[PDB]
Amino acid sequence: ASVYAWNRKRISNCVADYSVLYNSASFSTFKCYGVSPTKLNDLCFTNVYADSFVIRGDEVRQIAPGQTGKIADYNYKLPDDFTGCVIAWNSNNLDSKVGGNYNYLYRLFRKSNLKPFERDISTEIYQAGSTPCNGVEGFNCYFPLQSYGFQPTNGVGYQPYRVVVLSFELLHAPATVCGPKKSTNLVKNKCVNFNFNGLTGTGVLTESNKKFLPFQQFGRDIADTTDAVRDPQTLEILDITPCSFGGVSVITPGTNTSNQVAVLYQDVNCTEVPVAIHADQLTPTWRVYSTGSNVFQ
Amino acid sequence: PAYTNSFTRGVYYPDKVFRSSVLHSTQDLFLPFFSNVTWFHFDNPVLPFNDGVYFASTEKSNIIRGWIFGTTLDSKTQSLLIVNNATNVVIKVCEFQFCNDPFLMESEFRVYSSANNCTFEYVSQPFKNLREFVFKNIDGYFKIYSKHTPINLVRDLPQGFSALEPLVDLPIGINITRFQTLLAGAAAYYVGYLQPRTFLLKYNENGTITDAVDCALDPLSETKCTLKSFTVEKGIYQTSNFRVQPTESIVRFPNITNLCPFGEVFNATRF
Amino acid sequence: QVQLVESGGGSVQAGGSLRLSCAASGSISSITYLGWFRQAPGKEREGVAALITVNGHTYYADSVKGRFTVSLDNAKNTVYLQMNSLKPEDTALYYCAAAAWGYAWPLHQDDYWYWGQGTQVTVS
Amino acid sequence: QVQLVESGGGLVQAGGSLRLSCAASGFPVKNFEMEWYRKAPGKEREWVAAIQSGGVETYYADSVKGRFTISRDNAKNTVYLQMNSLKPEDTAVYYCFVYVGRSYIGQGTQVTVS
Amino acid sequence: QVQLVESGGGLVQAGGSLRLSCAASGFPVKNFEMEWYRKAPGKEREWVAAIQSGGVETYYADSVKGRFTISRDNAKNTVYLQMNSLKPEDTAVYYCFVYVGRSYIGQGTQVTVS
Ligand SMILES: *[C@@H]1O[C@H](CO)[C@@H](O)[C@H](O)[C@H]1NC(C)=O
Ligand SMILES: *[C@@H]1O[C@H](CO)[C@@H](O)[C@H](O)[C@H]1NC(C)=O
Ligand SMILES: *[C@@H]1O[C@H](CO)[C@@H](O)[C@H](O)[C@H]1NC(C)=O
Ligand SMILES: *[C@@H]1O[C@H](CO)[C@@H](O)[C@H](O)[C@H]1NC(C)=O
Ligand SMILES: *[C@@H]1O[C@H](CO)[C@@H](O)[C@H](O)[C@H]1NC(C)=O
Ligand SMILES: *[C@@H]1O[C@H](CO)[C@@H](O)[C@H](O)[C@H]1NC(C)=O
């Protein structure tokens, strides 16, 4: 797009990852105002309108809140307390033809200052004196649409810095385009709290035996409790099981008869019981009643 | 004219929840059992929406194309458009000027001439064929259920039990009163209207509904809904209650009739 | 909220090597970019070295290209500037800086930085 | 969700006139009391003007009574501040202030009088 | 406040030499980047040469590499441009440029090779 015709384009109802922006190693003036660039992918905002121009690299640092200049006065202005990212990188290899890349004209002159976030287009010429121009170009006509000279012999400050503005405004609208959500791997046969794509709960992630039709995402059973789910990256059916729990039965024969105890663990497969009770937290007297030389089922 | 009834056809899953081998009682906008649906053919009438549309159609070739939705279908209210053709489907809402006679040798297009103020557009991928749909719009969300099944008879709707599975939920968010079915040979299409009813669903081992009863059709299905069973044993059962409603709501008050002297302070020659 | 302590300076002969260090304390996880500044006598403060903490990507100026090396140690939260094959034109005050709003190449003084105290490096 | 943004600043001379704005999002302005503060360089942050949440009463600071004008627009969700009879003692960055649960401060706009 | 004027123009033959000057005021030349442009009759305005603000890198256009030499004088606030191996394609009206807030364009000077 041009700076006279950077459209306020609506890209909506999709996702755009931003982690691929950092690692490709060509950014020049990648600047995120308001929100941190590290926390851009996980948390988003609404009003994700997008802008684009190949601005010249001499005054990219003039694009700042509370900073005017030439680009911020006659080309494009940030408002104060701006949330969003201005992302500049090198554009020497492709937007630079022989004899000067005269494909992007630019508005050099304007009668007043720009309001921020305004796309400026004009056909008429600048007025500076009292004598009006009669169509034929004269001494005070001052044609604003000059040309950026983008030659391959230009340096890194003279070659264009390709800016894109992922501006984040705040209006009463639903959010459309956000960054990606990071996911961990999946474990099996352990009592784990799980964060799926919409449902969360506590249980044991087990390998399944049934299968679904291709339009169920999850499933429940008698009396409305979730028992099955499918992962969204590999698409395999998975049944869940409730976690280990229950009671400890400890033999006492009465105070006057004896003192020592034996220990029974009801409704538990007792191979994971020092993970179950806090034997590493309690006394060493409690430590010898999570195991022993004799094991009976 | 041309009214035919439904022999327990058009029961959909109310959600994506899989339930296996359990009897479940739901409450959503369903179709009542044994209700009249119309039959049309040449003919392209406009029909009201009326809180849910159940649709069925039997075809040999694709004579029916799609449907046009909206309130006024003129150049002051936005109207929805679905047109199906050869290699894609087209879903869009714009400001439409629909023709007085909308119709569509291999190609014809004279349904609208209006290309201003578009807001949304969406592209997806598409007697022998029986297509059954549900056209509903709840809280700005347009839900489509579908089932393709073969039917080979040219008289009426066949019987049998089959389910309807949801495909597209789309944030449209405009209001709908009428809709108009679009065509290009003659074909048939059935249109019914939904009603807020309470149903009881029987699930199999794989979670598809094999049979269902409606809880206001006859007292035996009322008994089946209250007992949560599909075979009801020999006995006497209590289902609900009833109360006679008041009719006139009469007003009695005494003889007011005391006659304050306001006539002298409303009719005198000197106050 | 971000504090930098710079050490490792000193005097060296022409053709020697030095290894500066800049130790960070405070909001470590907010730091996204570390740059090395240089203020020559009789010149403005310029930019020499660059390092992105997220990526490990490095950028170097043309006057230090092929001779200067920047390295990051996240265990000690200390960035390093390995300056090998030194010449007496590099006799200047060297400053380490921290950024938290992103990375910008080349370095400029007018942005928001967390400044160090600076050490003296003399090559003769 | 709540954010104040400020515009309308510029360079004026002694006795000039200007009009700022404080566009707000995420909350209606018929329910919260509104303020403005300013930061001169070398001086502390001092309160300028206030209108209450009902929109009935107006208040100002001691040196700016009779010369500054505060106005509110509930339709556009924007609060404006009017400059009359500007002196170079008011060379400051003007921040608009509101208490919506917790107080939020905008980045402000530089207004210089010279 | 800031003004550019170009002088030192003239008419030379094929193979002649010339040296122009661009007098500057209101700004120092050690802090901003300047550019040279020219306007041939019947052709659009084309960038000739430039010096950066640091004074380290010198740049020229593609058609004038190896023949032009640009230089600056920081004390006299004047930036010069030396012409060598002149062709009749370089018949143009030369302007010097600077971008300090507003772009400043001089009145131009005449360079004619015939
Ligand atoms: C403990 O008391 C019970 C009943 O009082 C008695 O049967 C038992 O023998 C006693 N044991 C001892 C060791 O005294
Ligand atoms: C208990 O767990 C062990 C460990 O795999 C297994 O071999 C055993 O069959 C389990 N017993 C019961 C009763 O679940
Ligand atoms: C359906 O229509 C027919 C004829 O119009 C009528 O006899 C029949 O009673 C209707 N069905 C119901 C359930 O009322
Ligand atoms: C387009 O539709 C919107 C919907 O509210 C309306 O506000 C606007 O005036 C319309 N514009 C034109 C040109 O019809
Ligand atoms: C549709 O019409 C009703 C009745 O006038 C109105 O309440 C509703 O807001 C309208 N919906 C839209 C989306 O305009
Ligand atoms: C006053 O007299 C007139 C004519 O006799 C009558 O129509 C009117 O009802 C009287 N006013 C009242 C309050 O009765």
Numbering used by the authors:
A (entry chain C): 348 to 644
B (entry chain E): 26 to 66, 79 to 141, 153 to 174, 186 to 243, 261 to 347
C (entry chain W): 1 to 124
D (entry chain B), E (entry chain D): 1 to 52, 52A, 53 to 82, 82A, 82B, 82C, 83 to 110
Article, verbatim:
The spike glycoprotein is the most prominent surface‐exposed entity of severe acute respiratory syndrome coronavirus 2 (SARS‐CoV‐2) and possesses the vital molecular machinery required for recognition and fusion with host membranes. The spike protein mutations that cause increased virulence and immune evasion are predominantly found in the receptor‐binding domain (RBD), which is specifically responsible for host recognition via interaction with human angiotensin‐converting enzyme 2 (ACE2). Here, we present two synthetic single‐domain antibodies (sybodies), designated Sb#15 and Sb#68, that recognize non‐overlapping epitopes on the RBD. Cryogenic electron microscopy (cryo‐EM) revealed that Sb#15 binds within the ACE2 interface, whereas Sb#68 engages the adjacent conserved cryptic epitope.
